[PDB]
Structure formats: C-alpha cells, structure tokens
Structure 1
C-alpha cells in the first residue's frame, strides 16, 4: 500500500532495444523505475555520461514513471539513498545468472533491506549486448535493428569525429 521504486543500474553504453524492453516491462509492474547509469570513472566507457543519459531519455522519456540519473559508488549506498524497493537486472546467459546470484547475495549482506528481481529478455532481444553492438558499429556494420535511431545517429557522429 506504500509505493514501489525499482532501480535499473547499468553502463548503458549504449542503451539497446534490449534494455528498452526491460524498462518498459518493468514500468508496468512498479510505480517508479529509475534508469541508473554507472558513470564508470575508472572503467572507460565509449559514450560519456551525458551521451548515455541523453540516448536513454530520448528512448524511454515517453514513459511517465521513468527517471534517469547518473551514479557512482557502491550500488547499495545508491539503493539506500534512493529509498528503493529493489534492483532490477536482466539475465541473458548462464554467466549473467551466476554473477548476479553472487552479487545479490553479497549486497544482501551489506544491506539486509537490499533486493534483486530479474527479468529474462524476449527471444527477439536475447542476442543483443552493448559490447557486441559497440564492436559491430566499430567495424562499420549496421546496428539499426538492435538499437534506437538516436543511437544509430550517435554512432555516425563518432564515425564523423573519425572512429
């Protein structure tokens, strides 16, 4: 009867149609969804925080219950700051499933209030990762089918500053 707030953390480098599916799905089951972009100070993304948030907003802004925020630090401290109900993650593969079980268990020890829920992607998005998309763009392949148009354009505007 209170009000539910789920955080969806990630690097979103860049956001993909995969991520869009998950946020949309999550937006139907929870009151507020926060798309939370890990800055990644000492981890070196392709797109800046500003590009990453912008492409996210461009792609999911039409959902009234979705917020977008950059963060760094310990996910559990962010979790607490945001007074969240749970963290959402997607599970694509067996390695994902194992990493995430570990992380959830660790975070529960750091904050007993912590929680993690998981969605699995529809089969149309099961093969999409950011990394794979970077690599395909990088080799002048066509990523239109896997990402929003804004992201296509953003890839062209790095191929324009050279890349």
Structure 2
C-alpha cells in the first residue's frame, strides 16, 4: 500500500503541476494533492476553488484525491498514514531550496521526499507568472487546464 502527498498552493494548478500529479499517480497506489491554506496570502482563488479546479483536471486519475491542508506538512502526511512527499523541480535553485525542506522534514518526522524533473514543455510555467502574464493580456491558454483557464478569465473580468 504505497502512497505520496503532492503539496502546493496551486493558485491555480497549471499543466506543469498536472504533469507531476499524473506521474506520481502512475507510480504510487495512492496520491493525495494537498492544497495548502496560508492565511498570510488569500491569493487569487479560494481554497475551495483551487480544490475544485484540481479535481476537474484529474478526473482521469482514479487513485488521486484532493484535500486542503494547514500546519506542518509532515503532520498532514503522517495523519493519513503516509510518509512520502512528491514535488516537481524546474531548476537547481528549486533543488537547493527543496533539499533543505526535505532534510528538515525527514529529520523531524521521518517523512521522505521524492522529486521529479519538470516536463520540458512546461519548464517556464509557474502559477505566479501565468497570473501575471494573463493579468496584462498575454495568452496563457496553452499552459493551464481548459477549466482553469476559463475560471482565470473570470477572475480578471
């Protein structure tokens, strides 16, 4: 009974994230996407909206579910009986930042972290940059799930 948690703010989920979800879901029996609620940033979408967007985009993944999360990620992981985190990485800078978190998380709770390399086609997409470009009129429709994109257009208009 293997399993992994995929955390993020996902504000909104991108095709880069979806690619990671698909790859995690192909290698672990159970995947939980953890939408991390931060009260020190509302962001663009509500936690409810983010969850909904991810659920819509992951319907073809039978072994994946989506839940909101607060507090220590390692507590989220262990309270669900798991002890692995899966995250995507774009750059060596990402790796150095996530290395520190991964080692801390292993130290405090025995939770391991597995990283995957970004899909080449989505190397430059981040939720933040997608929102920024879209805000000023750039076409990001090829970078986001179809559902998300329409919802993003809504938030701007």
C-alpha separation between the residues in 2 aligned to 1:94 and 1:23?
A: 21
C-alpha separation between the residues in 1 aligned to 2:34 and 2:59?
A: 14
| Partner in structure 2 of residue 155 of structure 1 | 152
1:115-134 map, 5 Å: 115-134=112-131
| Partner in structure 2 of residue 27 of structure 1 | 25
Alignment pair present for 1:136 and 2:136: no
Alignment pair present for 1:110 and 2:117: no
Are the equivalent residues in 2 in contact too, given 1:14–1:47 (CA < 8 A)? Answer: yes
1:1-163 map, 5 Å: 3-111=1-109, 113-160=110-157
C-alpha separation between the residues in 2 aligned to 1:95 and 1:138?
A: 26
| Structure 1 unaligned residues grouped into runs of 5+ | none
Count of matched residue positions in the alignment of Structure 1 and Structure 2:
157
Are the equivalent residues in 2 in contact too, given 1:6–1:88 (CA < 8 A)? Answer: yes
Q: Equivalent residue of 1:88, what SS? A: strand
C-alpha separation between the residues in 1 aligned to 2:64 and 2:81?
A: 15
> How far 1:85 sits from its partner (Å)?
3.4
Are the equivalent residues in 2 in contact too, given 1:6–1:84 (CA < 8 A)? Answer: yes
Q: Equivalent residue of 2:5, what SS? A: strand
C-alpha separation between the residues in 1 aligned to 2:147 and 2:60?
A: 14
Tell me the C-alpha RMSD between the 2 structures: 1.0
> How far 1:80 sits from its partner (Å)?
1.1
| Structure 2 unaligned residues grouped into runs of 5+ | none
Q: 1:76 to 1:85 in 2, by over 3 A?
A: closer
Q: Equivalent residue of 1:144, what SS? A: coil
Moved runs in structure 1, 4+ residues, more than 6 A? none
